[PDB]
Write a protein that binds this ligand. Sequence first.
Ligand SMILES: Cc1ncc(COP(=O)(O)O)c(CN[C@@](C)(CCC(=O)O)C(=O)O)c1O
Lengths: 360, 360
Amino acid sequence: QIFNFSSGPAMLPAEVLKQAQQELRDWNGLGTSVMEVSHRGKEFIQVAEEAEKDFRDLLNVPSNYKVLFCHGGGRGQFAAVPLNILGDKTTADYVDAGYWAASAIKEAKKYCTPNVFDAKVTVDGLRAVKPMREWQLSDNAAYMHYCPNETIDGIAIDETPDFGADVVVAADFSSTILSRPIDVSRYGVIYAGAQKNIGPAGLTIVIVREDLLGKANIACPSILDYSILNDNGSMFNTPPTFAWYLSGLVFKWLKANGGVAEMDKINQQKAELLYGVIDNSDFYRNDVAKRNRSRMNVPFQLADSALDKLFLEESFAAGLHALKGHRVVGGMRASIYNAMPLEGVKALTDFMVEFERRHG
Amino acid sequence: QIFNFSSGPAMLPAEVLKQAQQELRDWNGLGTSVMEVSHRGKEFIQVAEEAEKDFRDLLNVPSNYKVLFCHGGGRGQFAAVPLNILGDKTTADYVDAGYWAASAIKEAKKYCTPNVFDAKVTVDGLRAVKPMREWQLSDNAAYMHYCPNETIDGIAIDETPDFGADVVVAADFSSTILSRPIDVSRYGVIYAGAQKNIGPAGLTIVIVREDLLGKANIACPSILDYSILNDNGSMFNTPPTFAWYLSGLVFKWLKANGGVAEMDKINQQKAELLYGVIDNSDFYRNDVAKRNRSRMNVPFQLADSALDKLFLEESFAAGLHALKGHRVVGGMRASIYNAMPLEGVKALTDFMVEFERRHG
Ligand SMILES: Cc1ncc(COP(=O)(O)O)c(CN[C@@](C)(CCC(=O)O)C(=O)O)c1O
């Protein structure tokens, strides 16, 4: 078997893919593909609603939150948030503690003067993040934005926000959503591209608190306008029908396997197994504090970088794909999302030990 | 067999879909799906480049035009064009002659004060469009916008633009591109959502003349910024990888079948067959002038609208799906894109005659 450690687009559940394949040309006895069906037809509309319903059950999303499905991916959202919830304030709080947290800030500059807070710190030579109670927010700010899971850095902030009514929290859960249960009520906006932990590329999920709607800037393209999307049930224009369909299958696969509570347990074992191998070895090394170690994305450097190529050739031949670290960082990176079975994180750890043994 | 006359998402070539199905879980002997592979990997990048190359060969797109692949669909473009090529001007020419031509104007209002030209005219009781030589353009206008093929109205403007080298033409080819050969050099911008005549929903193709780049409004979200997309090879952020892949298969299917010249030849005999049945019958009727009849979308009303329901039940049982007209116009509508074979069109005309001979 092959185990894909790509970070996005990512590996999808084998069952989900085995089904999509089978009914690719004859979905629902219709004799056509879901891709060929009109988005307005009752057949698809049922898929779309069921999709949202399952999603709400999974995260316990309360009635006062709208769940939208749009184009653009995560970066489209770096623009959408400012365009939608900035209202008429001229600033917003942005917490930088990683590559993605920073990218969001760069886009935000187009629409306002963002107050940046550098939450990055180094403790015991290990990369960590300042606790929320130490974050500097401003008074005038329309909202505060931050990223709970840096895909490149392997940094995670699991702390639950506790700023109080006055503050609106916007977060980028692209690479962590559905990995652990979260209290949605603490947030104002939660967005996430599907290509990492949900489904395929092309679709993006957004969770907005209803009272935040109706403030959109006139300049906001209608396809990004939260109010427009909500009023049309995420069907203002033709949506990524196939992507929405697969997401639906994934959501079902999740409920079928115990929901996010069970996923959280499994994700915990997978992370511990891997991080256990890295810490106990001299050959491999991760430089992130225990308190901030992501369970989704795990970057690691080799003691001898001259072996990087050989590690990649041998890991690939062993059926372990996409282990190369991000471009701007080098090293290695194993992304172990919900779809990645513990059995797979084991195959990787088995290989890593065997490599260290005969090359280390 | 089943013949899907949906107007978007539309029917895809049977070969293209068979293939996509076969290698759904093991694409390129990789043992993974194209959906699970990263867009930064060499495997996909080769698909993406090959995709663009085939597309350029098909339409003979000269070196001074960039070909972009983005999110948002056609309605994302109603915003993108104004945001990108409006430059430092405050007004643009917009030619209304249909639902889509009008929708574009509606979005444009967000970014400027558009000069609208009503090209709609009724000749002999038949709906027609004023010839381009009679179109009123303004002096200060940053560009002129129009839609050569109204999907809902069944109106088509095949006339080749010939205004001043000073005039910049932007067009919405969503439902007609690749149906007949066109002289790209006449246009400044050509955009089109893939769900109609190319591939699946989620992807959008744009053809921009290079000298038009670098004018983008600061407010334009980066994912829509033509310059940003060009600089990153349409890979600024994760793109709709599966959609891009299918489009590639379609482009190959086209070259394999004779290119746009052969398609034009077949599309002509599909249109003539159908319009021949409608004109020669008293039961069915299309009210569009021969000079403006779309060969892609063919709307038709029944003489007795009380039979609409029965026409739909019987046509569906006969394996002819999605024949219902649009909500706004009512009636019926057969969309016969490139993927729709002549055998499929004949099957429809055979049915229409039979139905008449039994209820008319
Ligand atoms: C000619 C044309 N331009 C733009 C669009 C909008 O496409 P997206 O919704 O942004 O992908 C379309 C769409 N035509 C549809 C599919 C509209 C259906 C609907 O009610 O939304 C059609 O069936 O005509 C164009 O045709």
